[PDB]
Structure formats: structure tokens, C-alpha cells
Amino acid sequence: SHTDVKVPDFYDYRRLEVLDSTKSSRESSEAR
Amino acid sequence: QDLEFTKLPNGLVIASLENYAPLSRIGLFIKAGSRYEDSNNLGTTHLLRLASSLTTKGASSFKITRGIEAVGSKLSVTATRETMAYTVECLRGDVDILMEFLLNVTTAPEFRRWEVADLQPQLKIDKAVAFQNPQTHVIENLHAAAYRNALANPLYCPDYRIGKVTSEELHYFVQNHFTSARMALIGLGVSHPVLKQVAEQFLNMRGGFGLSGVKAKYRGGEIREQNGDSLVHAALVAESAVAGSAEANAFSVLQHVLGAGPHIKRGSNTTSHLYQAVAKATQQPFDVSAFNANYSDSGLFGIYTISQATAAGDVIKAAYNQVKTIAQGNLSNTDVQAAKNKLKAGYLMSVESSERFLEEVGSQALVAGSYVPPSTVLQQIDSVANADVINAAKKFVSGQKSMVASGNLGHTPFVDEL
Amino acid sequence: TATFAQALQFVPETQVSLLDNGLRVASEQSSQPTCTVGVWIDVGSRFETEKNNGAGYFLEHLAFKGTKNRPGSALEKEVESMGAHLNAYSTREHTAYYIKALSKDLPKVVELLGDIVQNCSLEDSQIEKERDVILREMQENDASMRDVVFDYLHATAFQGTPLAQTVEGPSENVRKLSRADLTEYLSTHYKAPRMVLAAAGGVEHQQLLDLAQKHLGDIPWTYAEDTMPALTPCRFTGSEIRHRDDALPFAHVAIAVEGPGWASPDNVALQVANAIIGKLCQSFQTFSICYADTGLLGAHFVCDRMKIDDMMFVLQGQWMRLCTSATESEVARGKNILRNALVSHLDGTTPVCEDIGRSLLTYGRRIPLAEWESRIAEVDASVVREICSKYIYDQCPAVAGYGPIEQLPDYNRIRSGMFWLRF
Amino acid sequence: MTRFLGPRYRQLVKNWIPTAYTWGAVGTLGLAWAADWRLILDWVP
Amino acid sequence: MLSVAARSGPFAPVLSATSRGVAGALRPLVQATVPATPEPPVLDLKRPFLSRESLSGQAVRRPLVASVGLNVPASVC
Amino acid sequence: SASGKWLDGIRKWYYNAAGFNKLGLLRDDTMYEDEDVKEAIRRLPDNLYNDRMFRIKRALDLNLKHQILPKEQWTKYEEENFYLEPYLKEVIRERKEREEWAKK
Numbered sequence A: 001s002h003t004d005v006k007v008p009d010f011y012d013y014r015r016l017e018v019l020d021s022t023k024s025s026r027e028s029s030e031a032r
Numbered sequence B: 001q002d003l004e005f006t007k008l009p010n011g012l013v014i015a016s017l018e019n020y021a022p023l024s025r026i027g028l029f030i031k032a033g034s035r036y037e038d039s040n041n042l043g044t045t046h047l048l049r050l051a052s053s054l055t056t057k058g059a060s061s062f063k064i065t066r067g068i069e070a071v072g073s074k075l076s077v078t079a080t081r082e083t084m085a086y087t088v089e090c091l092r093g094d095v096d097i098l099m100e101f102l103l104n105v106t107t108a109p110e111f112r113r114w115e116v117a118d119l120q121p122q123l124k125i126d127k128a129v130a131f132q133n134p135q136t137h138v139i140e141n142l143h144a145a146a147y148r149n150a151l152a153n154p155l156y157c158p159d160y161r162i163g164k165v166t167s168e169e170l171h172y173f174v175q176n177h178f179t180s181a182r183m184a185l186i187g188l189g190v191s192h193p194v195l196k197q198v199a200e201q202f203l204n205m206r207g208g209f210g211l212s213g214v215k216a217k218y219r220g221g222e223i224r225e226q227n228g229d230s231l232v233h234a235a236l237v238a239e240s241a242v243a244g245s246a247e248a249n250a251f252s253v254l255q256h257v258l259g260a261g262p263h264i265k266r267g268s269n270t271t272s273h274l275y276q277a278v279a280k281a282t283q284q285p286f287d288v289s290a291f292n293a294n295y296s297d298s299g300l301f302g303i304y305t306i307s308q309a310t311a312a313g314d315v316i317k318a319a320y321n322q323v324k325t326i327a328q329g330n331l332s333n334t335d336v337q338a339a340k341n342k343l344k345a346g347y348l349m350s351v352e353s354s355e356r357f358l359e360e361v362g363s364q365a366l367v368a369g370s371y372v373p374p375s376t377v378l379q380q381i382d383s384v385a386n387a388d389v390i391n392a393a394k395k396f397v398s399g400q401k402s403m404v405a406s407g408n409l410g411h412t413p414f415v416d417e418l
Numbered sequence C: 001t002a003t004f005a006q007a008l009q010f011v012p013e014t015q016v017s018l019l020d021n022g023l024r025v026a027s028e029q030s031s032q033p034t035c036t037v038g039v040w041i042d043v044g045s046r047f048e049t050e051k052n053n054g055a056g057y058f059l060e061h062l063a064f065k066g067t068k069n070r071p072g073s074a075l076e077k078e079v080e081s082m083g084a085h086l087n088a089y090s091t092r093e094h095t096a097y098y099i100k101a102l103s104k105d106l107p108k109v110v111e112l113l114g115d116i117v118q119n120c121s122l123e124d125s126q127i128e129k130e131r132d133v134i135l136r137e138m139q140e141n142d143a144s145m146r147d148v149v150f151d152y153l154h155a156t157a158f159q160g161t162p163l164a165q166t167v168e169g170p171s172e173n174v175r176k177l178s179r180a181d182l183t184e185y186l187s188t189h190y191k192a193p194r195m196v197l198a199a200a201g202g203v204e205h206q207q208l209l210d211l212a213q214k215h216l217g218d219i220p221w222t223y224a225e226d227t228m229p230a231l232t233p234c235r236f237t238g239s240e241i242r243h244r245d246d247a248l249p250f251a252h253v254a255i256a257v258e259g260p261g262w263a264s265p266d267n268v269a270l271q272v273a274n275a276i277i278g279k280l281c282q283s284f285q286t287f288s289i290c291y292a293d294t295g296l297l298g299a300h301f302v303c304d305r306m307k308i309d310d311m312m313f314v315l316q317g318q319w320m321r322l323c324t325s326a327t328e329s330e331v332a333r334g335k336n337i338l339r340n341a342l343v344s345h346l347d348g349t350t351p352v353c354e355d356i357g358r359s360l361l362t363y364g365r366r367i368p369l370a371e372w373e374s375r376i377a378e379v380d381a382s383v384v385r386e387i388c389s390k391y392i393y394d395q396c397p398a399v400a401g402y403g404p405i406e407q408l409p410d411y412n413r414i415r416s417g418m419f420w421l422r423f
Numbered sequence D: 001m002t003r004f005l006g007p008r009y010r011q012l013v014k015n016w017i018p019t020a021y022t023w024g025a026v027g028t029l030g031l032a033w034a035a036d037w038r039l040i041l042d043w044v045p
Numbered sequence E: 001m002l003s004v005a006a007r008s009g010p011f012a013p014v015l016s017a018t019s020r021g022v023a024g025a026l027r028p029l030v031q032a033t034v035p036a037t038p039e040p041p042v043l044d045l046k047r048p049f050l051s052r053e054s055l056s057g058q059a060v061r062r063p064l065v066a067s068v069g070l071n072v073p074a075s076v077c
Numbered sequence F: 001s002a003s004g005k006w007l008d009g010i011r012k013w014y015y016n017a018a019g020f021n022k023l024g025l026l027r028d029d030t031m032y033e034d035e036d037v038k039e040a041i042r043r044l045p046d047n048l049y050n051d052r053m054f055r056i057k058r059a060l061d062l063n064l065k066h067q068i069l070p071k072e073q074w075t076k077y078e079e080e081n082f083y084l085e086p087y088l089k090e091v092i093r094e095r096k097e098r099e100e101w102a103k104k
């Protein structure tokens, strides 16, 4: 059925502004 | 703190119980339903239960809808073949205006041509969602097969009648069946004086009794519906006993000896005679159980099966034979005691919640002069013997059968060859 | 005569106690001949790694299949001879086993309940039978479309984090999980200070506590080697998953933003907002799904394929309306709807027992209806405006769609709908 | 009209006042900047 | 045990019918989306037979035969 | 008092001056179909609806032919039927109720 679902990894494209994780999520959002 | 039955000069019954609950519930119960229709006005009651927010002499449709929403409350309608019920739920202090709404919905409806004619196409939709679960249409056919006239009439509107139920029919039905001597008002979360203030508004409504109807006559029918489905559903019954009878208690205990339904999640139902019988006749998925209905002037008892299409004949037979062994008196004290345990416990669990408790009280109020507490019910259960159970099984085995089946019937048997 | 709020004072208290191993016992006594009793456990799919994703569901399949003291169907026969019922469930975050019974049977009930959680007989034959059953149950399309879209939503929103993974897990895993994995799972997660024993109905608290010491007091409490698995911290991603199949009758759609979690106060106000929102299409709902540190806040609907765009427009417009223009009159209605829901849910012993257990796991304490009423009374249109703006306005959503979804708007078009140019 | 006298309309107008005077500021400053309107621009440091 | 629900157990939801009126505060189970049945072919109206002279000969005396042709209307005996 | 006969006199004068009776038309036929009027027309029973439609077509045909009915067939002031007024009053009440809800 569906349960085998998994999004493939997007590591190459994501911003470093969330990978450098020492700041709450929503504040990051605001910076971006 | 206890219930208090009472009857007004109109013949209206009223009862109440001040449980200190934050949510008050009030039910108006009526002797009406599909059994009082005839072939010339079928489907009237279905549209009647859907029409429970059209305009009235006392309040506009817009007013009823928005006013009930604005406090968070609900107004439900529930029917059977024999009774209808209008129920209101509200927070403490909301009663009065909602009671005005209840009064106008039941005693002074308008059935304006255009609103009725805009409401018609919803019958189709409601019946469709009902008929997604296959059990419903099988049971509907079972009543048609089992009876010639009254309990035969369908709960959902016939297809040929959709779009052709008229305002005049609604008016006539309400005028001839919504009468004060057919009624009870029940209140949970409400002090008797307050419920008296409510019932006071009903003093000038339609009095006396109405049209009494006809007695149901038994048919030894058979209905077959052919589809392409790989699973076939079947029901096989006979006539058993009237509601509120000792013999009906016998039949109940028999149902619970044979097997009434599961108790463990993903279990094997080792206690269930029918399930264990069938499990040795088929190796693909099946379901089986026993069936009870009871009415005012009749009742039905039988078996209900679901199986693969090629296995049906083996399943239906394997089930039936099991009952026969009880008729011959292969029955054990241990089974009987376990069955009575299941029955007493299931009964007490069925009335934990106020919603079902209200229903049960309202059902009693329409047919008896005094409320029967559960202890008395438990004793009546305790009082069934083994001989009563065996006699009930013999009644089933001997009497004339009715049958319904739906699916791919290339291997289903005919009622004459069981 | 009383007021609603005054009737909320008559509801009885919930008593709570501790054993020496740190298991907590909680009860609410309601003077009835019937009762519900269960064990709630602070374990779920978000503690499993990709190596054993799906273990708890497996364990749930063979929980009631036998213990050492009661081999095979003996347990089932003893439950059925009392006239009692036995049930279980498993979630992204919790697990539960409970029993419904007569109040007379409490000593046996607890006994059985302790026999089940400490002494299941994980026999190879039964393991293989459950393996075949679960594989068969996964082979055919035995899932409802609603479940499909909600699983897709969790997968896209919480990708790269344990919450993305499903309770059942992949089929590749059930054909490959072993008894060693099951016993390791139990040894590592089923520890006393993570468990609650809850009861509602005609149950006395001290009797329950005595029985708890007798039948549950030997459950260990020493977490060993910190054997508990290390796992990834929480993150929410604005993203979409689209599964197109133009043969299905109707399109299913789900869209959320990130909610605050169990602990925050804001939840109350949000619920009010929900009640205000909830024609075009057949079916529609709003929802809040809470976790420990995060959540999903959004809506779900079904449409004919030619009416997806309009419906999305209507929904996002209502969101913007609440963020910018709410008024007192509607807010009052929403508060009343919320009051009615809260009091309607807690009817009968089962829901109450369940509430006790879930509450002691999530909140650390039972929150009485009076406190909820006091929290509801403080909301007003200004609070709704503020908090809706705080979680909805100009945010990136997570979207999932299944069906004939050609007309589902592009992601940029959906993102631009989360803000107004005239504000 | 006579319809739009009542509580909801008062609340609704109060909801939009701030946005209104902000757009007013935008329009005024833009007009001045566009027409080099010295009457306003001579006061800008 | 005089209500359908207290008596019938798991068959109560098919032995009873309900409509919950104007929308409530909680959200119900089994929501049931509606793929309704398609419409049949549309046809001309039927004439009545309100005389014996018009009904005379309508009753069946022999079983039927089904017919079709490549340049003739389809027909039934 | 006499004032009733006097007002009814001027009203009859105005009615004959208007002249839709020369075309065989009732007063309620001559309303402009705004939203409320269309909803009131939706509510009519079949007989009234069909009578209205034919009357209107007949007036249009006469106007096409720059002609009028014989005097014998003109609509008379003392035996006219305001068949649409009741339905219109209900439609307007409903709209007023909704408006009044909308300001709270």
C-alpha cells in the first residue's frame, strides 16, 4: 500500500542558514 | 437521586432526573415510523426526518439554524420502524429557547412547497451514504421477505418516489400520528419542576390517539440480488418472540451461546460456537454471527454470514447444523452461564453514556407504566433455564424460514434445500 | 439551580500515587457497576530507527496471543468467560492496552493486565504467523485515502526526522524483523517510569494501589547503558508531495503549517479559530495534531477535479480573514462550540480512563474542566487575531495531494496565498 | 443605506484603521517624492 | 432492554436510522463521500390505456424473441 | 369618512391614465425584475406562472403591431388581482431578517 512512502533527500539544495542549527526555528524563518 | 414518571391529562408522559452534569439532554419520543406508511405514501417519514429544520409558524428556518449554532447545541432526529425521537443537547441555562424550537418543530410545522421541493434531492444522497455499508441493504431486504405488510416497509425512501413526496402527505402524516397520547418527554440534567414548565407548552396540542395501523403478517419469502462481488452476504431467519417477553430472554441467551460478536482485538473467538464450526469448513476469510430483532407484535431470530462466493454453500450449512445440535439438546451449564455473563455485562456497558441511557428510558416510557431498573433486568436474565434455550432452538429449527442473499450467487443455496 | 461553570465544580477529583519503581497509578471513581482499566506507555514510532521501524505494531499483533502463565488461547478464554472486552492501540507517540469489565472483577483484571505487559510468550510459530498476516494485510490496497494523505503529509513535513516515518513501517522490514529485535525493543523501552496505570468507573483508589504493588511492582526501572537510541532533532519543512492518479473518482488534499505542541497555552485560542472555520465540495475539515515539541495545524478536503482551485482560494481567504479582521460575535460562537465539544467527549468510563492516561503522559497532570473553562473565557477577538497571525500569516505550508490533482495550484501560487497585499 | 449601522460594522472598521493610515502615509510621501514637492521635502534632513 | 440499541448489539446501526440536523461541535466518524449513480437514457413519455378497447390484446400468450438488424430497428416479440 | 372615496377616485384616474389595462395586463405584471421580484416569481404555483407568461407575450405581440385590445377586454380597476404581492412581502421579510443578523 502507501506505508512505504519516503521523500528523497534534498541535502544538496538546502540553505546553510538552517544547517547551522543554533537558533530557534521560527527566528531562522524570519532571517531568511 | 432517581427518576420520576408522570402522566398529564393529555396523556403525555414526562420523566426527568437531575444528575449534576454540565450538559443537559432532552428527548421527545413518538410512536411513529415507517410501519405506519402504506404503498401509496412510501418514503414520507424519511423526508420527515430530513425536514427537521424547515420553517415553522413560530420560527424561521434561518432563525432555527443560526440560533441553535450560536450556543453550540445540537438537534438530532433518530428513527426506527416503530418510533421516532427528536433530541436536544445544551449547556446549563440554554433550555428555554431550544424548547420553543422543539415545540414548533413537532407541533406547528409549515411544509412550504418550494422548501420541500428544494429538499427532495438529498434523499438520494443520504440513502447512498447509508447503502455504502453492505449490511444495511441486506437487512432491508430481510424485512421485505419476512413480512407481507407493515414491518416490511423500508426505512429509506424508494427510488421511484424521490422527487414525488408532497407537502400534503407530510401534513397528513403529522396530523394523524404526532398526537399527545403517543408521546413522552424525557429530561436528563433537569429538575422535574423545570421539565413541568417545559411540558406546560404542550397542553393545547393535538389530543387523543391517532390511526392505529395494521398488524404485521409473516411471509416465508426469499430475495436474491446478483452482483459481481467476490464476497457474498447472507441472512437466514425465522419468527421468534415479542418485545418484552420471557421467551425473548430465552432467545437472547441462545444468541449469546451461538456467538454475538467479538471481544478481543484480532482474536480467534474460541468461545463462539458458530465461528468455530465455520472455521473448519473454509480456509479463506469469513464472518458469521447470530441475529435478533424484536418488535411490538413480532420478532426475528437467525444467522448472518459473509464468505467467499464459491464457499457460501459450505459456510451457510456449517452454521445451520450448529444450531440444530442445540435443538437436539447438546447444551452445557458452562456455556449457558458464560452466555448469561456476556449478556449481563454487555447490557450494563450499553448504558454507560447519557445518550444511550436517554434512548433506553424513552423506549420504556412509550410502552410501560413504570421504569424498570437494571437490577430487575439482570434478575430476569438470571431466570432463564437450559430447557428454555433448547426450546428456542427447536422453534427456530422447526419454523418456516426467510432468507436473503447478495453477491455472486453461483453457489449460494436456495432456502428450499437447507 | 447552578450555572455551567458551577456544575464543573461537582466533577470528582483524580487521585494519583506512585510505586517505588516509579510507576504512577491514577484513578477517577464514579460509583458505577462497570469500569475501564488500562496501562498507557510513553513509547511510539518516533523512537524507532530505520533498522526496526515497525516493531511496536508487530508487538501489538501478538500481545494477546499467550503468556507463560496462560499459554495460547487460555488468556482469551478467561477474558471471554468474564464477559469483558480487551483492546489496544499504537500511535506516532503512545501505546495503550486496556480492559472493560464489571467492577467486581478488578482483582483479576489487574492481574491479567500485569501478566500481559511482563510475560508475553514470543514464540517463533506465532511470530511467523503474524509476519504472514501483516504481509497479507499490506499486499492489497487496504488503506483509506484519508490515511494515505495524512501519512504523506507527515512524510513531507518532518522529512529527515523520526516523525516522518509511519507506525506500520515498510514491508521490507516486516519480512526481516526477528525475535531478537522484538525482545531488545521491549527491554529498552518498557520501563516503569514511562508507564501509567489508569482506572475509571466503580474503582476505589487504594484497592487499585494495593493490586498495583502486587502485580506491577516488579517491573524494572534502571535504564541501562543509556541503551536508548540516539535520534535526530525536530524540523519542519515547507514542501509538497503530489501523487497523480486520474482514475480515482475524487481528489484528496491536505495542507498544514507547524503548530506549537502539547505544552503551550496558545492551543486553546487556536481551537477556537478552528471552530469558527469548521458550498463547493463534498467534504471538509480542520485539524490540530499535537506532539511534544511540534505539531500540524491545517485542513483536509475532498473535491471534484474541476473545483480544487476555488476551494483552496476559499480556505486561504478564511485564514487571512481571521488573521486580519476577526470580530467578537463569531468568536463567542466558537467558544460555545468548544465548550460543548469538551463536555460531550467525556461520556462513559472508557473516554475518561483514556483522558487520564494521555494527560499524565503529555501534561504531567490531569487538567480539570474548570481550568479549561477559565482558559476558554479569556479568549477574545484580539487574542484570536494575535495568535492566528503568530502561526498562520506569511508562513510556508506543507501540502499533500492524491487523486486527479492537475488543478491543484502550483506551490508558488499556494505560498502567495498566505499573505495579503492590501494589509 | 441604514443597514450598516450596528456593532459588527464598528468592530470591522476598527480592524482596518491602521492599514488605512499606513496606506495614507505611503500615498502622501510618494506624491511628494514624485512631484519634488518642496513644501514637505524641505523638512526632510 | 426495550430500545433497539440495548437489545440488538452490533446490528443496532443497521436496525436504526439517524440524521444529526444542523452541524454540531464534534466531528463524526464514517464521513462517507458520495459517488452517486449515473443517469439512465432519457425516453419519451408513456401513453395510458384507459379503455378496454385499447388494452385488448396486450396480455402475453407466448414467450419472447429478441431481434436486431444492421439497417433495421431492434425489436422484441 | 369621505376622504377614502376621494383618494380612491384619484387612484382610479391614475390607473386609467397608465394604460397597461389597454394591453390586457395586470399591475403585478409590470414590475421590473430585480432580485427579490425574481425570487417571488420563482415561488409561484404553475397556473399563475403560465397565465402571467401568456399575458406578457400577448402584450408584446400587440406592441409589435402598434395595436390594443378592444375596450370590452381592458382590465378594470375594480376587479384586479394582486397575485404577486404576498410572495414578495415574504421574500423581503427574509432578506431583512438576514441583514439584521449581519450587524450583531
Ligand SMILES: CCCCCCCCCCCCCCCCCC(=O)OC[C@H](COP(=O)([O-])OCC(O)COP(=O)([O-])OC[C@@H](COC(=O)CCCCCCCCCCCCCCCCC)OC(=O)CCCCCCCCCCCCCCCCC)OC(=O)CCCCCCCCCCCCCCCCC
Binding pocket: C419, C420, C421, C422, C423, D027, D030
Ligand atoms: C508596456 C510594455 C508592455 C510589454 C512588456 C513585455 C514584457 C512583459 C512581461 C510581464 C507580463 C506581466 C503580466 C501581468 C501579470 C499580472 C499578475 C496578476 O494579476 O496576478 C494576480 C494576483 C494573484 O492573486 P489571486 O490568486 O488572483 O488572488 C486575488 C486576491 O484578491 C488577492 O488579494 P490581495 O489583497 O492580495 O491583492 C489585491 C490588491 C493588492 O494590491 C493592493 O492592495 C495594492 C498594491 C500596491 C499598491 C498599488 C496602488 C495603486 C493605486 C493606483 C495608482 C495611484 C497611486 C498613488 C498616486 C495617486 C495619484 C492621484 O490588488 C487589487 O485589488 C488590484 C488593484 C490594486 C490597485 C488599486 C487601484 C485600482 C485602480 C487602478 C487604476 C487607477 C487609475 C487612476 C489613478 C489615480 C489618478 C492618476 O492577484 C492580484 O489581484 C494581483 C493584483 C495586481 C494589481 C496590479 C495593478 C497595476 C496598476 C496600477 C495603477 C496603474 C495606473 C497609474 C496611473 C497614474 C497614477 C499613479
Ligand SMILES: CCCCCCCCCCCCCCCCCC(=O)OC[C@H](COP(=O)([O-])OCC[N+](C)(C)C)OC(=O)CCCCCCCCCCCCCCCCC
Binding pocket: C394, C419, C421, D026, D027, D030, D031, D034, D035
Ligand atoms: C501621477 C504621477 C506621480 C505618481 C507617483 C507615485 C507615488 C507612489 C510610488 C510608490 C512606489 C513603490 C511602491 C511599492 C509597492 C509594492 C507592493 C508589492 O506588491 O510589493 C511586493 C511585490 C512582490 O514581492 P514578493 O512577492 O517578493 O514578496 C512580497 C511579500 N511581502 C509584502 C510580505 C514582503 O514586489 C514587486 O514586484 C513590486 C514591484 C513594484 C514596482 C514599482 C516600480 C516603480 C513605479 C512607481 C515609481 C515611478 C513614478 C514616476 C512618476 C513620474 C512623475 C512625473
